[PDB]
């Protein structure tokens, strides 16, 4: 940049990838894979087949690939991340509130650095932490070591609400608790009829 900055443009972080997706011709890169797919060696063709699966979907649907890079993050309504009071006077909140709070904390600190014209080393190292915060809010633990809460317990991210036996699907959609029901010990009764 000090020498030939007039000639090229580069960037770091997530905002750079946002620029690559904009300067991207979907139809051309789709056809470029089709040429390799039409006549190619299996070693390097299978790796070209799978790319088309992703690229072709963006082309037909009419939805831009830019959605993979976020300028704004939605906040889930509060009753789905409720903060309950405890019989000891203190409080207890959902882990989603500590994740949303950490995104807000780091996003507001970045707003100060941009205003202050802080050195690029602090702004870039801050922007990195904002990426890890949104990564933790959406899927904590996916990349690297997860955000531990008090007691080295990993916080439950938004995507943790949908996975496995404790997730929303299996715990609250495939099976539910029902009214008009009970349970007790069973005792054999020979006098009863089969019905």
């Amino acid at each position: 940049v000090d020498r030939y900055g007039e000639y090229f443009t580069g960037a770091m972080g997530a905002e750079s990838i946002q620029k690559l997706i904009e300067n991207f011709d979907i139809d051309a890169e789709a056809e470029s894979l089709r040429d390799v797919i039409r006549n190619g060696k299996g070693q390097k063709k299978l790796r070209a087949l799978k790319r088309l699966k992703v690229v072709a979907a963006f082309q037909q649907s009419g939805n831009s690939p830019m959605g993979m890079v976020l300028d704004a993050v939605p906040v889930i309504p509060p009753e789905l991340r409720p903060m309950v009071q405890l019989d000891g006077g203190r409080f207890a909140t959902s882990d989603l509130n500590d994740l949303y709070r950490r995104v807000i904390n780091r996003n507001n600190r970045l707003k100060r650095l941009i205003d202050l014209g802080a050195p690029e080393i602090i702004v870039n190292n801050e922007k990195r932490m904002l990426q890890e915060s949104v990564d933790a809010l959406f899927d904590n633990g996916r990349r690297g070591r997860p955000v531990t809460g008090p007691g080295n317990r990993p916080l439950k991210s938004l995507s943790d609400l949908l996975k496995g036996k404790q997730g929303r699907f299996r715990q609250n959609l495939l099976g539910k608790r029902v009214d008009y029901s009970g349970r007790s010990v069973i005792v054999v009764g020979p006098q009863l009829k089969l019905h």
Partner: protein, 47 residues
């Protein structure tokens, strides 16, 4: 609210869709006030 609707569509949420959903920006990081139990303005529980 009848229970017959054919398709359930999913897709990428544009950053412009996220603002279309939102009833305001969560600016401050505070939650509530720990005396009055009233949520702070522009916080994570802003009324």
């Amino acid at each position: 609210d009848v229970n017959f609707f054919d398709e359930l569509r999913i897709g990428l949420a544009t950053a412009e869709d996220i603002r279309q959903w939102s009833y305001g920006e969560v600016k401050k990081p505070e939650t509530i006030n720990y005396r009055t139990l009233k949520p702070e303005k522009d916080g994570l529980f802003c009324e």
